Design an enzyme around this catalytic site. Sequence first.
Site, PDB file in Angstrom:
ATOM      1  N   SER B  49       8.210   7.051   6.048  1.00 17.30           N
ATOM      2  CA  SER B  49       7.050   6.532   6.765  1.00 17.30           C
ATOM      3  C   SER B  49       5.748   6.624   5.973  1.00 17.30           C
ATOM      4  O   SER B  49       4.755   6.014   6.391  1.00 17.30           O
ATOM      5  CB  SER B  49       6.864   7.280   8.100  1.00 17.30           C
ATOM      6  OG  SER B  49       7.928   7.028   9.013  1.00 17.30           O
ATOM      7  N   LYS B  52       4.108   3.388   4.964  1.00 16.47           N
ATOM      8  CA  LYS B  52       3.214   2.617   5.818  1.00 16.47           C
ATOM      9  C   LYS B  52       1.850   2.414   5.171  1.00 16.47           C
ATOM     10  O   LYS B  52       1.159   1.447   5.503  1.00 16.47           O
ATOM     11  CB  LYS B  52       3.069   3.288   7.188  1.00 16.47           C
ATOM     12  CG  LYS B  52       4.314   3.144   8.074  1.00 16.47           C
ATOM     13  CD  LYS B  52       4.013   3.504   9.545  1.00 16.47           C
ATOM     14  CE  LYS B  52       5.240   3.276  10.460  1.00 16.47           C
ATOM     15  NZ  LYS B  52       6.299   4.337  10.322  1.00 16.47           N
ATOM     16  N   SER B  97       3.560   5.893  14.038  1.00 14.97           N
ATOM     17  CA  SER B  97       4.538   5.619  12.986  1.00 14.97           C
ATOM     18  C   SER B  97       5.607   4.649  13.488  1.00 14.97           C
ATOM     19  O   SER B  97       6.809   4.903  13.397  1.00 14.97           O
ATOM     20  CB  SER B  97       5.153   6.912  12.445  1.00 14.97           C
ATOM     21  OG  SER B  97       5.509   6.767  11.070  1.00 14.97           O
ATOM     22  N   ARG B 229       5.270  20.748   7.992  1.00 16.17           N
ATOM     23  CA  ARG B 229       4.634  19.812   7.067  1.00 16.17           C
ATOM     24  C   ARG B 229       3.119  19.999   7.072  1.00 16.17           C
ATOM     25  O   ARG B 229       2.490  20.127   6.013  1.00 16.17           O
ATOM     26  CB  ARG B 229       4.998  18.372   7.436  1.00 16.17           C
ATOM     27  CG  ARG B 229       6.500  18.067   7.406  1.00 16.17           C
ATOM     28  CD  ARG B 229       6.759  16.665   7.968  1.00 16.17           C
ATOM     29  NE  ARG B 229       6.413  16.593   9.389  1.00 16.17           N
ATOM     30  CZ  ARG B 229       6.477  15.494  10.129  1.00 16.17           C
ATOM     31  NH1 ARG B 229       6.842  14.322   9.608  1.00 16.17           N
ATOM     32  NH2 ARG B 229       6.154  15.564  11.418  1.00 16.17           N
TER      33      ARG B 229
END
Lengths: 242, 244
Positions: B49, B52, B97, B229
Amino acid sequence: EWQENKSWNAHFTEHKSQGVVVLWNENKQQGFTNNLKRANQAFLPASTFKIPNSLIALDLGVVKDEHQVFKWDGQTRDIATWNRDHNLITAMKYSVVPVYQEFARQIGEARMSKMLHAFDYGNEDISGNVDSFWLDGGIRISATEQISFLRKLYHNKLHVSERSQRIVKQAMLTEANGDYIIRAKTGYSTRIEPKIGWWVGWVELDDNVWFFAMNMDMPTSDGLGLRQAITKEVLKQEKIIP
Amino acid sequence: AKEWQENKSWNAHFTEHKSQGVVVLWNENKQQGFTNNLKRANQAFLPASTFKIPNSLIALDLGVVKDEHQVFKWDGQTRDIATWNRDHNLITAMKYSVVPVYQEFARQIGEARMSKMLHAFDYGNEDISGNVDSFWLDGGIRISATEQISFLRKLYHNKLHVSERSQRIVKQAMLTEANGDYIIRAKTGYSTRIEPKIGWWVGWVELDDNVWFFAMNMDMPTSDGLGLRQAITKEVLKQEKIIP
Ligand SMILES: *C(=O)[C@H]([C@@H](C)O)[C@@]1(C)CC(S[C@@H]2CN[C@H](C(=O)N(C)C)C2)=C(C(=O)O)N1
Ligand SMILES: *C(=O)[C@H]([C@@H](C)O)[C@@]1(C)CC(S[C@@H]2CN[C@H](C(=O)N(C)C)C2)=C(C(=O)O)N1
Ligand SMILES: [Ca+2]
Ligand SMILES: [Ca+2]
Ligand SMILES: [Ca+2]
Ligand SMILES: [Cl-]
Ligand SMILES: [Cl-]
Ligand SMILES: [Cl-]
Ligand SMILES: [Cl-]
């Protein structure tokens, strides 16, 4: 049209204050306020003038972009954060008046007046000094007029480049989280009575935008935090923000 | 380019979570990079993702997306992520997302233009083999954390070979966090189609006086570690006194 919701007056009375909050629901094309009279009362814009001033400076090239460094003029002033070099982002964030007074001198009376007329900004009267008329001059704008101006900026419909409008909206960024984004400008007008506080801007949600403009009596600086606190009380009560 | 500096103490923030990964930081003012693991910093993975970001840029530059308010209608297929099952614009498609929206972007861009644009960007290995609407999920494109930094630096400075306007719109869509101390513009990622499953967070932290670029990835055997993350990145940022 416009709806008076007088129960919001409680949020001012709570804090022993007097003022107006104006909200505009963009999806529904509806406005709300606790006081139509004061919502249409015109005051000095003071530091909220940094929004049109930024736009004009950018469109004319006085400001090349948001990274250009504007050197401290070497006068030590009371607010320490003003006594350093700035760009557009930090001059907005710290509301650095001397940087914006220099923009106004470089724009000049003729172009400033023409652009405020093109913006339909308040009463479009720049009488006074070219570098302080939004502080102690003839310009006046109401909360409802702040909304109308901000709505045009949000939609890139002011008669300046799209790029100028995008940069100023970046510089207006105040708060962002997973629930909302606030782009806004505070103000505190002290040079001419009545001394008032301002907060004008908008809240971006996933599926709507709420514009807001508030002003309140501000006889001393001790109450300045109420500008955001009272606005957010209203936004929370209306389920606009959690 | 100054030689990268390896701060092994950052590994403590991986081991305290029984985790394995890399954080890469870049101090723009000093033009100095830092990482806990130089080898993994340069290891290339599927962008998932995080793609993007370039996909948005190319779609805007080519007019596939007119602006950040254009509405992309839900195709009506119910998918497992509930926020995907509605209409979206560029802002909410990035925030949630929404893969199907970006798969349609890629199909409209097409193979030839997307290859040209990724070569112009020098994006990772610039290899788009596979399906035009999934090569960043299960095809040939790979990018390392240091390569993410390089790409993000160009975006920050409006240096990519697309219009300034497209870059400004994408940086707006990347807005994640803002307060009186800092602004974060970033994109999360979670690569699940091909092993090793990994998590990503890439972006930057805007300070009053500096910008700190970051790119992290970490093994993600289960979704239970996804919060690390952001959490590992932020505690590294805090350790270096970049954010309070
Ligand atoms: C703008 O309206 C005003 C200018 C014209 O003086 C300005 C810059 C004063 C400050 S209030 C004062 C300065 N820094 C402190 C502060 O802002 N806060 C929030 C405590 C006190 C403002 C303002 O809008 O608050 N603007
Ligand atoms: C992109 O990396 C990944 C695609 C390829 O599936 C995607 C959409 C999965 C999610 S993680 C999972 C779905 N949404 C939740 C989430 O953690 N976030 C933050 C959106 C849980 C991501 C992702 O951006 O984290 N990307
Ligand atoms: Ca007019
Ligand atoms: Ca916009
Ligand atoms: Ca930790
Ligand atoms: Cl000002
Ligand atoms: Cl209009
Ligand atoms: Cl994707
Ligand atoms: Cl922004």
